[PDB]
Amino acid sequence: MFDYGKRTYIMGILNVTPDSFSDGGDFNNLDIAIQHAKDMVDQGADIIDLGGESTRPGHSYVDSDEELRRVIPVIKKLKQELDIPISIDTYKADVAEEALKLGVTMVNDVWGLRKDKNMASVIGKYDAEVCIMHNQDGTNYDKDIMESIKDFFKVSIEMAMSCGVKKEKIVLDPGVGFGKDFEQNIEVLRRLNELKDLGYPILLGTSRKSVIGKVLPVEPKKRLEGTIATTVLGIRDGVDIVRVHDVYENLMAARMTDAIYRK
Amino acid sequence: MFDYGKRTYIMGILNVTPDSFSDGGDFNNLDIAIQHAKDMVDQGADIIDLGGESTRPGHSYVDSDEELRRVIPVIKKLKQELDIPISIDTYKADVAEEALKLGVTMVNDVWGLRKDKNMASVIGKYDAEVCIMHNQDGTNYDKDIMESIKDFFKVSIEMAMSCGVKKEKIVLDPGVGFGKDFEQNIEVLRRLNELKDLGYPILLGTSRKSVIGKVLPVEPKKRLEGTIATTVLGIRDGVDIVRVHDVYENLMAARMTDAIYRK
Numbered sequence A, B: 001m002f003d004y005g006k007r008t009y010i011m012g013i014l015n016v017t018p019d020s021f022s023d024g025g026d027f028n029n030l031d032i033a034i035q036h037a038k039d040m041v042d043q044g045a046d047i048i049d050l051g052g053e054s055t056r057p058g059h060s061y062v063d064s065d066e067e068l069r070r071v072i073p074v075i076k077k078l079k080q081e082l083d084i085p086i087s088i089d090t091y092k093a094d095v096a097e098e099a100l101k102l103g104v105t106m107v108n109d110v111w112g113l114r115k116d117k118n119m120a121s122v123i124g125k126y127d128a129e130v131c132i133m134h135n136q137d138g139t140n141y142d143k144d145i146m147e148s149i150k151d152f153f154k155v156s157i158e159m160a161m162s163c164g165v166k167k168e169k170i171v172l173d174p175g176v177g178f179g180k181d182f183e184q185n186i187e188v189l190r191r192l193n194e195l196k197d198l199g200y201p202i203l204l205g206t207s208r209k210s211v212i213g214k215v216l217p218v219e220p221k222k223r224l225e226g227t228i229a230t231t232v233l234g235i236r237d238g239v240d241i242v243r244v245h246d247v248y249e250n251l252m253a254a255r256m257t258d259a260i261y262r263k
Ligand SMILES: Nc1nc(O)c2nc(CNc3ccc(C(=O)O)cc3)cnc2n1
Pocket: A055, A056, A057, A089, A108, A109, A110, A131, A133, A173, A175, A176, A177, A178, A203, A204, A205, A206, A208, A209, A210, A211, A243
């Protein structure tokens, strides 16, 4: 969908769980969510990542009916009021399916096709783009952490292909903050360029995460300059897309980095 | 002076030319300048770079008597009111000399000892630290730009040594924005790690410069995320000290970068 290699692309985050709003009942949450997306697009987002379940640590599981009730109305308004690609942040195949029928472009799966056995064939079925993100429970790795991550991608890519997903539709993401402690997260960021060998576009998400908070012990929103650092280093290491809360600031840093390393 | 390699050090900029103040007469400018330095120290500056002549493009030349009248009172108050190292941003040996007699730690010479034949022996005489910055008039280079820069450092380092300057006192700086157009500035930033071969600590200054403005065409103060990008890339490339207007923001990015690459 994006012209990979020409520049860095920015994915803005739109969470529409109840905790995401001042008033989690308010019938105006739908319009608030849409205003937030209009703002991110004006700040220069290339795609919006919409989620109805939070994968942020110790948020609760949402059943897929509930998840769809949160995202379906937002997708409909986005699609009519805003000319922007949408990504659906879900690991559930039934959620993805409904989203894709409504014209969402990409499934962002934070379990990398492993949590729902139907996810790969849904992606194939709609010819969707997918982000395959590395994830696991706990922080144990018997091999080199970057070797494990690459092994995991190989298996997920083969699952995708067995269901007729085209290679050009896949984006990989190393899953900062997922199945990884501080040191492992640092190590993955340091070695991120090793993922370029697999030949696929890379997506990175660090924005406001605890890996930054451990270096910069301020409240999440005040970690922006850490996130900008990882955006910048990521692009130098081959990152194509960054998933961020603060679209304008990360885009400005990304343009500066693009001007130095992209041809 | 700094424990090079342990972390990135931050140099805050303190310009005390008349244009630097709301009211360039006001007898309170001295106290305003000192408040600005107290602020930078609280934001985490490691050293303050004080200048009484602006080397920003198309600012006028200041004679050294005038330059000293601007900086001497500021150095005296800094030295009594603030426990922070000071750098004197001057290419004039007589200015440097007076500053060094008052307890300034480093001479920051934006002509890399070439504009004043006495500068090297002044540095030697006081056992000062020096930043030797690459500079030239116009933008012509017959050799590879990084080869020219390194050749220039070799000559300036030999001048310093002939006057008994110790090797451990020298810091090099490639002089972004000086004798270099957009493309050359980009190229130097891209190749900055080649300067690590000379074995010396490196200082970088990009903050608010036109090289960033050409990628991010906003007013100088609004170029902060570009500057943060160059701080981050610089540290990865071996930079030890960054010279910045916005101390807190660059320090936060530098700590994030230090946590990823420094051992
Ligand atoms: N593709 C993709 N890539 C991500 O990196 C990501 N992150 C989240 C949010 N996840 C986390 C994880 C950990 C932490 C913490 O340690 O603080 C915070 C948030 C949600 N969707 C995501 N999708």
